């Protein structure tokens, strides 16, 4: 079982600024993880695939990369319909995981 | 140069009925039945048919499952060949396996392959730049209607092709016909990747359309003449009348 | 349009059981793997149990042994039968596809609507 950590648990950023989050997994999975934005009352809607790879239809303004252990989510100008709880996912190996999730 | 070429619509379904059978080993067998278990399309099973009308082309990303039966009915040529991989992208190595005019083509190559990839011949337009190869074949092609089925096999390390191509008559349903066919081996590509996914590639320059099934570990028993052809095939796990059937060995 | 639609859900005691269920539509259903996964009140998403495309290999998570993860793919119906229900498994079950590159292959991510389940 791998586990998968979160930082910082909650941030606060206005419009127009640069919002980074870190995830962190216990083992290497290269390059499967998935990225998970989630509105309140909402199912999770994936934004990145296989690390950095963006989703069709996800805005050119949300990124993300790395690799084994380390990776990064970054939001290069904050906009007002991006307040959402975001989530990282392993898919290495079974069972699969998700992260806390980051307030935003 | 990769070009960003739609909608998405809902799948169809046919009828496979008795078909996807093709010969499990390289040994003559004749005037037999003889049982053996492999992973075959079950028989009546529920085939994804999938269109190229030209304002449609259907060329969607499918999972590979753990083998492949597909089919294809058109006069025109379109479907010229597969990509085979995990990510397809330069992350990765990627299985390519492309026909034309004069021979066919296959590779194994970091490809990082097009959002929407196919062939132009006024061309590769199927990806943008690739990495180091590890694999190389050059061979002689593989391609009323022509009606060519494959089956796709990827077993320790092997990518195991059997082909079959006869004509067939045009109906107007333009379902899969009736009748038994067994499938010849083709080639036996020893490349050692893990296939997980795959896609179609067609050319652009006509009206197409192809089958999409996903093979099962079953037992059948196969009955071969006097010319060791398979003439026909018991599904053994169908129905309480081929299990008697095939216990009994008698058709 | 693709669909997922949970169903089954309520109230129910400790110790009880209840089966779940989820009606697939728009898709190449008997083709893909499924997932279910559980979201509690004021918690984040829990992975629960994983089938393969053929309804022949299972996997579980917290819930293994108590669980049972099944299939038919001539209804295109997902289901999770629970025994033993405890009071730390009420939550929002939903059932998705979850886009996948090396076990179920799944090129696409489809979520449904989720169904409460209670247990008290
Ligand atoms: C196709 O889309 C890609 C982005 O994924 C873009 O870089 C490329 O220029 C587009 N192709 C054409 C011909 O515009
Ligand atoms: C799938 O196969 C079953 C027979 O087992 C058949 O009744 C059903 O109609 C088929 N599904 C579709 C969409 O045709
Ligand atoms: C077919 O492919 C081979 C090998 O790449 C090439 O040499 C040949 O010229 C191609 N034929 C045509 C008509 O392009
Ligand atoms: C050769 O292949 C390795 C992967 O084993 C890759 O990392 C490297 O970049 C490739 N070399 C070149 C020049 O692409
Ligand atoms: C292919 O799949 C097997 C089984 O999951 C795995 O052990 C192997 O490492 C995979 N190969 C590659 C290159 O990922
Ligand atoms: C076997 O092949 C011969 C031709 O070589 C043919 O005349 C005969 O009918 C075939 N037998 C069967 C059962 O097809």
Redesign the interface.
């Given at each position: 079982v791998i586990w998968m950590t979160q930082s910082p648990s909650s941030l606060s950023a206005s419009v127009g600024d640069r919002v980074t989050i870190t995830c962190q997994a216990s083992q290497d999975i290269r390059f499967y993880l998935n990225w998970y934005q989630q509105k309140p009352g909402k199912a999770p809607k994936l934004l990145i695939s296989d690390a950095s790879n963006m989703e069709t239809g996800v805005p050119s303004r949300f990124s993300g990369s790395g690799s084994g252990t380390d990776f990064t989510f970054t939001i290069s100008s904050l906009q007002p319909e991006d307040i959402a709880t975001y989530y990282c996912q392993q898919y290495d190996n079974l069972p699969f995981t998700f992260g806390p999730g980051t307030k935003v | 140069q990769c070009v960003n070429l739609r909608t998405q619509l809902?799948?169809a379904y046919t009828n496979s009925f008795t078909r996807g059978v093709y010969y499990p080993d390289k040994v003559f067998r004749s005037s037999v039945l003889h049982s053996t278990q492999d992973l075959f399309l079950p028989f009546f099973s529920?085939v994804?048919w999938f269109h190229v009308i030209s304002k449609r082309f259907d060329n969607?990303?499918?999972?590979?499952?753990?083998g492949v039966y597909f089919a294809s009915i058109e006069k025109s040529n379109i479907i010229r060949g597969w990509i085979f991989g995990?990510?397809l992208?330069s992350?990765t190595q990627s299985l390519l396996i492309v026909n034309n005019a004069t021979n066919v083509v296959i590779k194994v190559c970091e490809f990082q392959f097009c959002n929407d990839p196919f062939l132009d011949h006024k061309e590769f337009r199927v990806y943008s730049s690739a990495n180091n190869c590890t694999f190389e074949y050059v061979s002689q092609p593989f391609l009323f209607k022509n009606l060519r089925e494959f089956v796709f096999k990827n077993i320790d390390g092997y990518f195991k092709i059997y082909s079959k191509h006869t004509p067939i008559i045009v109906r107007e349903p333009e379902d899969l016909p009736q009748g038994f066919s067994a499938l010849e081996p083709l080639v036996d590509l020893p490349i050692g990747i893990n296939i997980?996914?795959f896609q179609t590639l067609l050319a652009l320059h006509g009206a197409a359309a192809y089958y999409?099934g996903?093979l099962?570990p079953r037992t059948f028993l196969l009955k071969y003449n006097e010319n060791g052809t398979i003439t026909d095939a018991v599904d053994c796990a169908l129905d309480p009348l081929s299990e008697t059937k095939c216990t009994l060995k008698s058709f | 349009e693709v669909q997922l639609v949970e169903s089954g859900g309520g109230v129910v005691q400790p110790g009880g059981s209840l089966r779940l269920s989820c009606a697939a539509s728009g898709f190449t259903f008997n083709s893909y793997g499924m997932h279910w996964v559980r979201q509690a009140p004021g918690k984040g998403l829990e992975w629960v149990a994983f089938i393969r495309y053929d309804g022949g290999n299972k996997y579980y998570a917290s819930v293994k042994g108590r669980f049972t993860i099944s299939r038919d793919n001539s209804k295109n119906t997902l289901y999770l039968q629970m025994k033993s229900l405890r009071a730390e498994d009420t939550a929002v079950y939903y059932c998705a596809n979850l886009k996948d590159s090396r076990y179920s292959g799944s090129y696409y991510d489809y979520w449904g609507q989720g169904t409460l389940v209670t247990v008290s």
């Open positions: - | 809902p799948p529920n994804t969607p990303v499918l999972p590979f499952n753990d995990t990510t992208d992350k997980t996914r999409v996903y099962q | -």
